[PDB]
Ligand binder design. Structure first.
Ligand SMILES: *[C@@H]1O[C@H](CO)[C@@H](O[C@@H]2O[C@H](CO)[C@@H](O)[C@H](O)[C@H]2NC(C)=O)[C@H](O)[C@H]1NC(C)=O
Ligand SMILES: *[C@@H]1O[C@H](CO)[C@@H](O[C@H]2O[C@H](CO)[C@@H](O)[C@H](O)[C@H]2NC(C)=O)[C@H](O)[C@H]1NC(C)=O
Ligand code: SSD
Ligand code: NAG
Length: 863
């Protein structure tokens, strides 16, 4: 045995020979660090009994256990393998108890498969019988993608395990964690997954969400595949240098999906097709958001709002944290410190801004006849709470307002209660979106106010390496009871179910609008309902650096609208760190400056009306807003096709192995390269310039760099922004809110490639109505440039913006002097455009032009 292939047979304790012998494993302490001293033997697990049986969907096999006696609970003697050739690029297999029904995730989007095995498979599946293994290979080149033969299948009631070899160490995904790097280097590492309120720091613990998907770039040709495990039980994922990955879960079933694609982007598309593509956001939600924990008073909140508006900061959304509530209670505001809250919301709305309020799941149980609490009263009447293990008494915990009960969002009647609570609150306070927090679910006591009973759910035979080492730590008892089942099985689905419910609520509170939902806890598929933020970070340079892989990973997960708390939640932020964080933060898909209780102000204007931080912030936010039609079109593609929005370099440049672990840079879509300074004291960054033509966004000049590391010079007031040759970027003159910006002239930036060609597109709809894509009420155009000619082509035209919008400026990068510029509208010349040329920089700008949005044009020139 090569020691890098050993599968650890004592994951639970320090290795000893007595235990090894007792478990039938192999003993060989003579390895390197982390190499398992005790590991599974070549032949001792399951075997196929009899023949495989062809089915309409695929095949089944009966697997039978070669007798080994109880280690982590009751073992499953007879396992059923069910395999389905669901599509040409998606393989599904599950391992279940032949004789007993077990918990299976009640996912809201994923459906059971009916009908027939797909034609034209890109993959082939091979099963071995003695012992059992399953292998998925790519048909085109026979590359083995999934191969469980490296280790056993373990299948006990509370311990299920399967391993697979991997064809490369280009592995990305898993969550929710702070991985620090984007690529998993595959040296020995265990990642626990169990939704938990915990700090995203350098310790690598389980965090708020549960995301089992990973993507593997097989080679430089771009060929890639992905694996997803549909299991909501506590689990851990073990990486080793074979290279190989092992999934080790303490409940449910092994329900796997394998996705193949020609590019990493196609693997993401295949995954999102299964689990659900992200919601198209409200266009306003792409603006800058400002927030903090404890303004304390409305007067304080208004002062912050007003100084940032005074500074002309692009600034669409104000969040209001639990300090707006009457004693941290949902669906109230503090009639004293937040006296006049309704008038403030009118002021926000009148300035074209939006209000997002925090809502916690936990409901105060403190209600009397003297002092009634309506949400508790109504929730109790409807009987919609999570119950203790008796199945009838609501479970009591403790969160912000004190003792609380917790909504059971898995019960359809709960969402009716939840909706009515929001419709009543909204009559008082006209919020525009909802921030759901503390939904792991997070509890200030362990399990409940009376703790947890000792039993196999609260105290299982095996516990993954979760923070604090008990399942019920800072959450509900594992034997608590909900409509979908016991908390042991569905704990990881609480935040998911809460987002589903909250989205159901938005149907009523915000009729036919998308609104905005931001969630802390997530499961696979939560991006269909909500944005995400990366949680309670800290104002340190480490946190700044760690933000990028977090953003990228959530994009792979189909939650593209993601960002951290810009400047850092915990701690006073240093000015230089906040300045570099706001530069980068202008380019996070979800851009929010948020701050913890007590710390100094970190809103941009608090640094001074004439500070470099404010100046720089406003400069880069105005760039963000200029480019919002490009960003919005990227979200349209994420929603309708499944593309990422914040994208790793390797997704566009996989042919170049220098891009495979770049994590200090990223792209917006295919064309915009963002290079932040992420080091204290630095005025340069060490960056990689991929193999393309690149133009400096601000000046339009073509960089000398191509396919190389560079020291990019970036002074206190600069972040690197380069546009890729071959791409056309739609823009719109910025303003301080998107309500206003969306009325402005549009522009095109044409970044020419080596052949003087470029392509791009623009999606445009009303920016807020739900189902504009489903109901095909939108504009989609395509731009293409070939040497002497720009064509504006209209592929869908069922929305005409009433603001009479037009392209009034075209900037061409990397061009020789155009001359004789002519504009035609469906063939008819022409109106005679002004052209300015910079011969040194090779930039042409065409003005005094009026190309109506939604109309076909040709713009032609000579050299
Ligand atoms: C939690 O306990 C309550 C009782 O406290 C259960 O409420 C039942 O709800 C249905 C209507 O949905 C009624 O028909 C039953 O009569 C209720 N029970 C009683 C005795 O009041 C609720 O079902 C429990 N929840 C779970 C998930 O088991
Ligand atoms: C940005 O939006 C503001 C609204 O906040 C626009 O404000 C002005 O627009 C008109 C001038 O063309 C005035 O007649 C309005 O009264 C005025 N409103 C204000 C400032 O409160 C402004 O034009 C927009 N600017 C850009 C660059 O688009
Ligand atoms: O450390 S402390 O801030 O007190 O509490 C954290 C640990 O439980 C919570 O997650 C903070 S919550 C999440 C944070 O975005 C909100 O601003 C806080 C108030 O709603
Ligand atoms: C790990 O957690 C501890 C608290 O238990 C914290 O003080 C420490 O800073 C963390 N370590 C890292 C590497 O961030």
């Amino acid at each position: 045995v090569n020691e890098l292939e050993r599968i650890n047979c004592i994951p639970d304790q320090p290795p000893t020979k007595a235990t090894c012998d007792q478990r039938g494993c192999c003993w060989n302490p003579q390895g390197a660090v982390s190499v398992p001293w005790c590991y599974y033997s070549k032949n001792h697990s399951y075997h196929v009994e009899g023949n495989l049986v062809n089915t309409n969907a695929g095949f089944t096999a009966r697997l039978k256990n070669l007798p080994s006696s109880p280690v982590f609970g009751s073992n499953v003697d007879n396992v059923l393998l069910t395999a389905e050739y669901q599509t040409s690029n998606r393989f599904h297999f599950k391992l279940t108890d032949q004789t007993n029904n077990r918990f299976e995730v009640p996912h809201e989007h994923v459906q059971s498969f009916s009908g027939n095995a797909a034609a034209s498979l890109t993959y082939q599946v091979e099963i071995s019988r003695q012992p059992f293994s399953i292998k998925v290979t790519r048909r085109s080149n026979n590359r083995v993608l999934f191969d469980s033969s490296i280790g056993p299948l373990l299948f006990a009631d509370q311990f299920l395990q399967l391993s697979t070899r991997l064809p490369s160490t280009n592995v990305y995904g898993l969550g929710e964690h702070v991985h620090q790097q984007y690529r998993h280097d595959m040296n020995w590492k265990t990642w626990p997954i169990f939704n938990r309120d915990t700090t995203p720091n350098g310790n690598g613990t389980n965090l708020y969400g549960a995301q089992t998907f990973f993507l593997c770039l097989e080679d430089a040709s771009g060929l890639s595949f992905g694996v997803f495990l549909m299991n909501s039980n506590a689990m851990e994922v073990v990486l080793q240098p074979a290279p190989a990955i092992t999934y080790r879960t303490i409940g449910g079933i092994l329900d796997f999906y394998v996705f193949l694609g020609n590019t990493p982007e196609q693997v993401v598309q295949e995954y999102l097709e299964l689990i659900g593509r992200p919601a198209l956001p409200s266009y306003w939600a792409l603006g800058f958001h400002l927030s903090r924990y404890e303004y304390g008073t409305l007067d304080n909140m208004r002062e912050v709002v007003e100084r940032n508006r005074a500074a002309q900061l692009p600034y669409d959304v104000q969040h209001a944290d639990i300090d707006y509530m009457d004693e941290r209670r949902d669906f109230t505001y503090d009639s004293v410190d937040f006296k006049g809250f309704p008038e403030f919301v009118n002021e926000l709305h009148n300035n074209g801004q939006k209000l997002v309020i925090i809502v916690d799941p936990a409901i105060s149980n403190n209600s009397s006849s003297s002092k009634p609490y309506g949400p508790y009263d109504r929730g109790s009447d409807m009987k919609i709470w999570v119950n203790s293990s008796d199945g009838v008494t609501p479970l009591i915990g403790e969160v912000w307002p004190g003792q609380t009960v917790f909504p059971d969002y898995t019960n359809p009647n709960c969402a009716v209660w939840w909706t009515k609570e929001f419709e009543l609150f909204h009559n008082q306070v006209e919020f525009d979106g909802i921030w759901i927090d503390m939904n792991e679910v997070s509890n200030f006591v362990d399990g409940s106010v009376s703790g947890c009973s000792t039993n196999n759910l609260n105290n299982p035979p095996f516990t993954p390496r979760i923070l604090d080492g008990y399942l019920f730590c800072k959450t509900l008892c594992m034997d608590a009871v909900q409509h979908w089942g016991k908390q042991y099985d569905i704990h990881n689905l609480y935040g998911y179910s809460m987002a589903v419910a909250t989205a159901e609520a938005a149907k009523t509170v915000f009729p036919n609008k998308r609104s905005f939902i931001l969630t802390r806890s997530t499961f696979a598929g939560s991006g269909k309902f909500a944005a995400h933020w990366l949680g309670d970070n800290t104002a340190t340079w480490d946190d700044l650096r760690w933000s990028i892989p977090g953003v990228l990973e959530f994009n792979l997960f189909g939650i593209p609208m993601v960002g951290p708390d810009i400047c850092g939640f915990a701690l006073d932020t240093p000015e230089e760190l906040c300045r570099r964080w706001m530069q980068l933060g202008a380019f996070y898909p979800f851009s929010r400056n948020h701050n913890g209780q007590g710390y100094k102000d970190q809103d941009p204007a608090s640094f001074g009306a004439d500070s470099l931080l404010l100046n720089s912030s406003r400069h880069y936010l105005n760039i963000r807003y200029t480019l919002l039609p490009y960003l919005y079109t990227l979200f349209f593609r994420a929603h309708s096709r499944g593309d990422t929005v914040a994208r790793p370099l390797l997704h566009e440049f996989y042919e170049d192995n220098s891009t495979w672990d770049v994590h200090q840079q990223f792209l917006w879509g295919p064309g915009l390269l963002i290079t932040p300074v992420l080091d204290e004291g630095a005025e340069k960054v060490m960056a990689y310039v991929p193999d393309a033509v690149w133009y400096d966004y601000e000046t339009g000049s073509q960089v000398r760099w191509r396919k190389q590391k560079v020291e990019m010079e970036l002074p206190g007031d600069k972040i690197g922004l380069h546009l890729r040759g071959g791409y056309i970027f739609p823009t719109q003159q910025p303003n301080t809110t998107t309500l206003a910006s969306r009325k402005n002239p549009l522009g095109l930036i044409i970044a020419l490639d080596e052949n003087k060609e470029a392509k791009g597109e623009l999606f445009w709809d009303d920016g807020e109505t739900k189902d504009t894509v489903a109901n095909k009420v939108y504009l989609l155009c395509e731009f293409s440039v070939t040497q002497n000619r720009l064509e504006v082509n209209i592929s869908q035209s069922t929305y005409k913006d009433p603001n009479n919008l037009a392209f009034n400026e075209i900037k061409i990068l990397g061009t020789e002097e155009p001359s004789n510029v002519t504009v035609k509208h469906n063939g008819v010349p022409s109106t005679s455009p002004t052209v300015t040329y910079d011969s040194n920089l090779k930039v042409a700008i065409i003005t005094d032009i009026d190309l109506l949005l939604g109309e076909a044009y040709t713009v032609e020139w000579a050299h």
